[PDB]
Structures are given as C-alpha cells and as structure tokens.
Amino acid sequence: QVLPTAANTEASSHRLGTGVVPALQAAETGASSNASDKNLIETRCVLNHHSTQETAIGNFFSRAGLVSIITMPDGYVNWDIDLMGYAQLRRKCELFTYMRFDAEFTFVVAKPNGVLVPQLLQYMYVPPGAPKPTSRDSFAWQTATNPSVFVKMTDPPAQVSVPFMSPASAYQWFYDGYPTFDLDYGQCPNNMMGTFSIRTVGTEKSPHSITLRVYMRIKHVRAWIPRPLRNQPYLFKTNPNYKGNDIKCTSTSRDKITT
C-alpha cells in the first residue's frame, strides 16, 4: 500500500458501554496494540500533511561515508576491499542483515599536511583470483583487462560507479557457519570482492608521501529482515567480539526511580 502522508485524526466523543474495550490488549501474542488515539480520549479532527519521503531507506542510506584511509609514506600498497572498518558506517549498515544495492565510490587524495602537489596516480581494482602486483614496475600494471583510473592530485576527486558484484542474491553481513567442510568462523565467501591497489606511475621513487581517503555512496538499496542495533564498541574488523569486562549499559543510569 502507498502512504504518502501519515494518517489523519478523526473526530470522536465520549463512550460508555460494556463488552467493547480498546484499552485492554494482549502483549503475550507478540503483536503491537492497534488501539488508536480516538478510542481512549476525545480528539478534534486534525489533518496532517507530514510527508514520509525523508524516512525512506534510499534517502536514509544515500550519504557518502569514510570507509578506509590509506597512507603511502615502496611506492605501492595493495589494500583489501572491506567496508567494516569504521563504526560511523558499520552501525548504519549493520542494522539490516541482507541488502542489495549499488555502490558509488569517491577518492580524495592529499598530502599528510593537506598540501596539494602535482603528481600522477593510478588505481586498479583487482577481482578475486586476478594477479596481484608486487612492485611499482610489476607486469601486472599493464591493466590488460582490469579497470584502471588515472588522475593527477591537483585534479578534482575521482568519481566511479561499481555495480552489485556478489555471486549470491545480496550481500550478507553475517555468516553463522563455516565456508569449508576457529578464526575461520564467520567468514562469508560472498563478501570478499577482491582487493585494491594504488601506485605512482613513474618508475622512479616518488619524493612525496601520499594519503588517500575513500568515501562510498549507495543507491538503489533494498533491505531485508532488520536486526537490533549494536550498543558496544567494536574490537575487531571481522567479528562482533566485545570487551567482556566493561559491559556498557544501553541507558544512562540515574539516582532514584521515584524521581
């Protein structure tokens, strides 16, 4: 059903009788009560036009966020592709279990102190099983088939679009089981989407340190089976392990229950 706006409130009056009772409910059945405000108090007729577009999953998720930072103090680094490295986004996408979406990436590159220097960089996306470069002049940099991006540092940040590349129907943030017939537990093969590598094009030694920031935007998202959020700080990038001593309470405590 379509609900462009929240339901209006109808007029009501006092009620006195036997048998009918909307106030009493049955929470043991596990169903939220369907009692409306018009069934307990006298309410005037109020028409509301509060739209619900801002609460759609697409608008809620359509916000770029930092996913990882890369520093280049040999001239190249091969960074594995993962999106669970920062809480600010991990908590957001971990509320659901399975989501199918479309990712858009943006790369911001600058020196450690933020100064900009003319320098040419190259980015390659290595699918799983593809050869992995091991040197600034490795033969794997010929990018015969793998996609490549070339951009100068002074140029505006690059923007690319990545389709949904999982073998399964949708990504899964949890895998209760083993992929093979203890650290292995919880590793879903359907999430390893290859790695990422950056380098300086010149065969010489670059004289400036390189820092890259990657922001991921989402679109055409579709969620399934929402799960409760997380109220404990993360400890690892793969499993929900937590500090077993300082169990943080969900709600801040007070002095007395009567006040």
Partner: protein, 228 residues
C-alpha cells in the same frame, strides 16, 4: 482462541490454554518455485516422513538461570529420518514450526521471551551445540554486543505463567540463496531468556521443566553425497 491443535504429520500437539499463532514476517512456508530454482537435478520431497514433530531434551528452569539457545538445523542434524537424510545430501531447503511448552501452577510467577533471531552470530565447538543446546553467559548483550531490550523487533511470542503456558512460531526459509547446505551453515537460532525471574513461596513444585518441540514444514533436498 485459548485452545489450539496442530496435527502436522503422524504427530499431534494440543493445548487447553495457549495464545495465538505468530507467523514470522507473514510468509507461509512453500516449496521452491521453478522461476527461482537454480539446481538442475530433480529434488526429493519425503513429505510425511520428515514432518513428524520432534521433541528435544528438557531444560530445568532454576531461580537464577541465565538463558538457553539453540542453533538450527544443527539440532535436527543428528536425529530421525531428517538426520539420516541430510547426512546423505548437499542441498537443503525447508521452513520450521517451533513450539515451546512450559506450564506451572496458578501460584508461580515469572516471564519468558521466546524469540527467534534469524542468522545468530556469536562472539567472545560451542557454535553448533547440537540437540542438547548450550546456555548463555552474558544474556544482556546476547554474547553478540546487541541489547536484549531491542530483541522484540524479531518475531517473538511471550510466555507469561499468569496467562499462557506455550507459544508457537512459524518461520519460513530465509536465506540469500534458494538452497544451502546443512552442515556448514545455520539458517537461524532461537533465544529463550527469562526477563522476569521465577519466584514462589517455599513448598511448591520446585522442579519446573522446559521443553522445545520442532518440525520441518516443506522439506526438500538435492544432491547425493556418500556420507558426511
């Protein structure tokens, strides 16, 4: 509405005082459709044989218990024709109907939260407890860093000794792939945590049992391995 009876297969469960039936996410279990199937081998549907209600062990509720949980379908992996069949195949798809029974006298008090959490992942062997089922250690965070106070967002039914003694949940097969193994993955887990501790005056039936009964609904299988 207080009474109900379920007669799936060669078994039957009756209750003279029970709440309503809770269907998970409003999707009745059903066989895999042709438009969604990816397997090319003809599957097998044992039907009546695998839908017999299976009763697991009995857990003893105490005045200071923490909670218990089970992993599915690892509980049924080692019992009955379902066990002897899943050990001979490679592809598995079925729903589940979960029934939990725990009855006390009219003078006892206490509450239970029977909730099925799909795709339960633990944190810091015990991952697959089996038919016995393991106990919890930190029920407030469910050993997974999530608050129990928000566990009601999942399909659940309350068992309050004041009103009812049993609860039922009918959960369909939920997984990102139409078929999936039975020895390397767990579709979902079940949580039973006493929110309100059991209290009673001295001189009552101290032994109070807890029993869980489950039964597959629309079982199907594919592939013929040797023995796993």
């Amino acid at each position: 509405d207080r009474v109900a009876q379920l007669t799936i297969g060669n078994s039957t469960i009756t209750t003279q005082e029970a709440a309503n039936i809770v269907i998970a996410y409003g999707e009745w279990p059903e066989y895999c459709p042709d438009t969604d199937a990816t397997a090319v081998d003809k599957p097998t549907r044992p039907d009546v044989s695998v839908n017999r209600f299976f009763t697991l062990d009995t857990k003893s509720w105490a005045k200071d218990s923490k909670g218990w949980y089970w992993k599915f379908p690892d509980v049924l992996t080692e019992v009955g024709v379902f066990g002897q069949n899943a050990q001979f195949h490679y592809l598995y798809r079925s729903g589940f109907c979960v029934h939990v029974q725990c009855n006390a006298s009219k003078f006892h008090q206490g509450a239970l939260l029977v909730a099925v959490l799909p795709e339960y992942v633990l944190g810091t062997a015990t991952t697959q407890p089996g038919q016995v089922g393991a106990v919890l250690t930190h029920p407030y965070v469910l050993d997974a860093g999530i608050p129990l106070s928000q566990l009601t967002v999942c399909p659940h039914q309350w068992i309050n000794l004041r009103t009812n003694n049993c609860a039922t949940i009918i959960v369909p097969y939920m997984n990102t792939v139409p078929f999936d193994s039975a020895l390397n993955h767990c579709n979902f887990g079940l949580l039973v945590i006493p929110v309100v501790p059991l209290d009673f005056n001295a001189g009552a039936t101290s032994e109070i049992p807890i029993t869980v009964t489950i039964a597959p609904m629309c079982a199907e299988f594919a592939g013929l391995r040797q023995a796993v």
